């Protein structure tokens, strides 16, 4: 999940820098909001779960700016 960001986001110009700053939700469900900074702005994305926050954020990062 992270190396298919780096690669799309840096072979365009999205600089991909995936950090978990995260490891939970509201008050019940363990979501790890994995933040996952692109070109010039961030975007996170809670995955549920410790190992898939990294699955989640970037799916987050190019689905958010690969599908527009």
Same mark, same amino acid.
């Given at each position: 999940?992270?190396?298919?960001? *780096?690669?799309?986001?840096?072979?365009?110009?999205?600089? @991909?820098?995936?950090? %978990?700053?995260?490891? !939970? /939700?509201?008050? *019940?469900?363990?979501?790890?909001?994995?933040?996952?900074? @692109?070109?010039?702005? %961030?975007?996170?994305? !809670? /995955?549920?779960?410790?190992?898939?926050?990294?699955?989640?954020?970037?799916?987050?990062?190019?689905?958010?700016?690969?599908?527009?």
């Amino acid at each position: 999940p992270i190396s298919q960001v *780096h690669e799309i986001g840096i072979k365009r110009n999205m600089t @991909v820098h995936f950090k %978990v700053l995260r490891e !939970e /939700g509201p008050a *019940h469900m363990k979501n790890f909001i994995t933040a996952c900074i @692109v070109g010039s702005i %961030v975007t996170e994305g !809670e /995955g549920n779960g410790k190992k898939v926050s990294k699955k989640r954020a970037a799916e987050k990062m190019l689905v958010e700016l690969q599908k527009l």
